[PDB]
Design a protein around this ligand. Sequence first.
Ligand SMILES: [Zn+2]
Lengths: 49, 89, 172, 108, 105, 229, 114, 64
Amino acid sequence: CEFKLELAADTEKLLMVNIVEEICRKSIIRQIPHIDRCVHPEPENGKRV
Amino acid sequence: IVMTASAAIKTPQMTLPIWNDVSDEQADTFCKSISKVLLSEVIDKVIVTETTGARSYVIHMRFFDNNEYSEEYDVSKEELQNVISNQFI
Amino acid sequence: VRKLLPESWGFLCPVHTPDGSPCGLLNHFAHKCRISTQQSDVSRIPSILYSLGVAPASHTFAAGPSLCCVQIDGKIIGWVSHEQGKIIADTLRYWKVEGKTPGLPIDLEIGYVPPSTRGQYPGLYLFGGHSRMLRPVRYLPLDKEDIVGPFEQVYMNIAVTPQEIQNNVHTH
Amino acid sequence: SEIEIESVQDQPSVAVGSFFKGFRAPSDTTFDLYKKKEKDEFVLHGENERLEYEGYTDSSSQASNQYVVGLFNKKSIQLYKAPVLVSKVVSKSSKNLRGPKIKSKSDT
Amino acid sequence: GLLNLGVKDIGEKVIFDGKPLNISNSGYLGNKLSVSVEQVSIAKPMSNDVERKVYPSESRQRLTSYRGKLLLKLKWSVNNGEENLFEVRDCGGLPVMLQSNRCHL
Amino acid sequence: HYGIQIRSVRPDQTSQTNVLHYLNDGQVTFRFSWRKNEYLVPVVMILKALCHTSDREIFDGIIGNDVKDSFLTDRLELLLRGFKKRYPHLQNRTQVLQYLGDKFRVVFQASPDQSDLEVGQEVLDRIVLVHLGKDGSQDKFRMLLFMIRKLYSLVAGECSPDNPDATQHQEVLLGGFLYGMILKEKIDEYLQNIIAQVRMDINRGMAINFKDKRYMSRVLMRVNENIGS
Amino acid sequence: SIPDGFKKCKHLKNFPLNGDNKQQQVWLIKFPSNVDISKLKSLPVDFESSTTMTIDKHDYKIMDDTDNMTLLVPSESKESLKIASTAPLQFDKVFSVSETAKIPAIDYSKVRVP
Amino acid sequence: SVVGSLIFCLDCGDLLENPNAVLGSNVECSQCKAIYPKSQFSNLKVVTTTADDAFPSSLRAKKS
Ligand SMILES: [Zn+2]
């Protein structure tokens, strides 16, 4: 990917490697409600779950 | 469960019984539509700068090859196009 | 902290500890571990150390894990690479149990640290003052009594009886 | 190969400047040296209108760890004894001391 | 030793007064004086009614303490130390453990 | 969560504590300890306080022959900009100390005749890295320079946490040395109680001068001498 | 101008320097004082760590170090120095001379007792 | 002199502040009238890198 910002002269050097990093791990490619990961377990006692 | 007034919990959990006919090989593919994929799952490196024009800032991301996030987490440009001018920006 | 830790090889009891509430808190010392009570009162620990191949203090300006900073106990005048680190790791161990040292005392704490694992910070560390903790051991070149503390027990190892000794994987 | 020490001497008459990486040497005022004689140490001063050269030698190990400098094409080196020197250049920043305290009232 | 060398580095402490001298008529408020401690040493224990030698087991025969006794030197200064009104004062006691330096064993 | 520390020790074995703390902004601050009172401070104002280093030698201590690392320059020039924000007229160690005379006059209980240059060096050399010794002008940069390259290298990941809970990092309080610590402390409370008897007379009044030597003997024994008690 | 350096410099000498841009350039090295600047007048021209010299202590170790300092030239007497520059003045290859105080060698014979 | 994204000097031996937070074309040392920059400031080119270290996945466990 590529995108270039611009910014005024007053505001100083910032955490340019951390201005991205903490955004990525909160940014989401598809939201799905209150749910995280699905596990396929072992079958047991006449039932696949 | 007994005392702590159980609420939003450390390990949320529920059991989903699947049908008699749905396969081993189709169920897990739709388990990857369920799995909450983050946005950071597709990046090799994030090289960022602080240049000057009047201060200039170009972010030059690097991703993976296509056939992994398309493979491992069953998602592609169908929302990676519209996460990158819509959510991350 | 209440569990025994395997960095405690030979300083306190693996076996003496009460049963119940002071479990893992109070547990006495080992057999022949000792405590230093006064410094290596020489001030020639560094006076031969620049001679032996270390650059001076304020003439080069290098720092970081790329170099191994020679910490005298308190003072520093030394940083080296590892290629002079493993030399001065145990060149001392040749001088320390050798009687041609009018400045290097028998009681002195030299622990090496290499830059492996990106773990501990790279240096060449010297100690020995008040409250320094001891244990004696047999250094195998020129087999002689020699003391170490627990800071040696990271990056220089001990054999437990001379049958498990084997090629260049023990030194004591 | 091998090469030989040609010339040893008695007095070393050189020093270094251990300022920092990249002091590009304006040479707008060439300054002097103030000797010693302990053994084999030196010290220096040097004037500008707003700037003074302040440099002495490390008493911890100066003559006890003595550099020399060599010179070759001939291709045979000669020794030349080299006292190293630490330096921290100063400038005009005096006169703060007139009124350090709260001397106006100062009954607090 | 240590605590001899402990209170060695002390400088020039002060305490001041309200008695004047004669711009800086109220600047130099009075006697610039000092106080310092140069020497302190427990030596040994004793007991009397000259001095005699006490036994350490004797001191817990008596259901008491192993009372040492402690001295303390005071070095005086005033006006960059022009008259050093010196004094030496004890501080009571200080107990010592058995087989020490400054016991009888 | 970051921090590297020193339990620096006086040569009479009564210590203090000099931690760092990693301000997530991009500065970095100290911490002291006192009576029951923590005294944090920014770092450059008692970095550039020892001897005359206002040049590249501030920067050149951080690694000189490896400038090429890019965690360095974007992170050291936000702490150095975290100080030029405060007072830009501050350039030599005469002037850099002078801030201590606003705060450190009555917190280490100084004299009112002392200017700040006598006390600011004094309030420095009581509290931070004493084991490098008094007159540590060259020898308090080069510790603290190296002491801060660790903390940047402890957030950038090329280091690892230590284990204070083990014999890796254990010492002994000998018990007799501790008993020899209190007789540095309670000696300097007996000395801090004859200077709490003179001014309780002279500000009560009718306290004649010491020059007649019995003014000492009327003040040196009215205080209770109970170090042993 | 505070201290007591007891002297002010007048006695000066010359540096051999051609200024030809094969090329006489400077050569500084590092070594201690307890050395052979009085008793061994020769030392090799070697590569990275490629010697062990012979005195009564019987070890000197030329090292290299490339991966500085302004250089001063007291040409005539009253100047007491200058700063050397062709147009700072760089340099090729510095030495740091240690002493290989070795270890007693491989022995697993007596120390490995059955 | 210049390191990283910032300019030092020769007379004063040290830096100056953000050249655009104060007057461009008009800068000197912060404490002495030693105006070494002649308004030819720098080419401000810094390039940093997040090293992909706290980006957990199931597809960075394969590269390890
Ligand atoms: Zn300037």
